[PDB]
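Quick one, tokens below. Sequence please?
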């Protein structure tokens, strides 16, 4: 039950469905036409953050420019959140871990050593906590925009407090839009949830060129590789 698995054949997905789940089998089969491998994340309610965090940092091993951009945005993000009302003493430890992971990528760590960091519960969860805070900060900052996404009567802040900041509260489109804008990154998600064997790609933000590909299924975000 690792936090982030080794690189696996797409066919491992067949195990996660009943023999009779004919439509999910057809989607898995179609996915083989587009992707080659998958890395599973533990299905614990943190999957989007964890999958995004690993996939993006792994991608930055191959793009020194993007690595420096990401580091700069990430460094600044702490003061940003503090200026907006997130307590510094509370969030400093999480930010320090996030920056240490970035440093690991800057030092040209192997994927194996990056993976080992993501499989340390404290290290990996500190990254997730930070990503959740970044996402909450962006939603709150652009609350007038995001208001319409929120069903039921809660304010954007109340939504953030109950559905984004807490560990184990799995992500949907609201999280993804906000985190992509927060870090100015581009995320493709294959939704395996559509018409036939079709999984339906969504790119966040629309119009961008993604370097992270994720697979959504109810209760899972996994990392896909072409």
């Amino acid at each position: 039950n690792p936090l982030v698995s080794e690189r696996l054949e797409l066919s491992v997905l067949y195990k996660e469905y009943a023999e009779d789940d004919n439509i999910y089998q057809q989607k898995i089969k179609d996915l083989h036409k587009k992707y080659s491998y998958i890395r599973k994340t533990r299905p614990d309610g943190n999957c989007f953050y964890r999958a995004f965090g690993f996939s993006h940092l792994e991608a930055l091993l191959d793009d020194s420019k993007e690595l420096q951009r990401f580091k700069a945005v990430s460094a600044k993000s702490k003061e940003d959140l503090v200026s907006q009302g997130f307590t510094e003493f509370t969030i400093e430890d999480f930010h320090n871990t996030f920056m240490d992971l970035i440093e690991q990528v800057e030092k040209q760590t192997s994927v194996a050593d990056l993976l080992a960091s993501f499989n340390d519960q404290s290290t990996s969860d500190y990254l997730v906590v930070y990503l959740r805070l970044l996402t909450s900060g962006y939603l709150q900052r652009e609350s007038k925009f995001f208001e319409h996404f929120i069903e039921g009567g809660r304010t954007v802040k109340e939504f953030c407090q109950q559905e984004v900041e807490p560990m184990c509260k799995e992500s949907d489109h609201i999280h993804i839009i906000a985190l992509a804008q927060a870090l100015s990154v581009s995320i493709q998600v294959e939704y395996m949830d559509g018409e036939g064997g079709t999984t339906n790609p969504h790119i966040f933000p629309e119009g961008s060129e993604p370097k992270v590909y994720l697979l959504y299924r109810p209760g899972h975000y996994d990392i896909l590789y072409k």
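The chain has two domains: 1-41+186-226, 42-185. The chain has nine helices and six strands.
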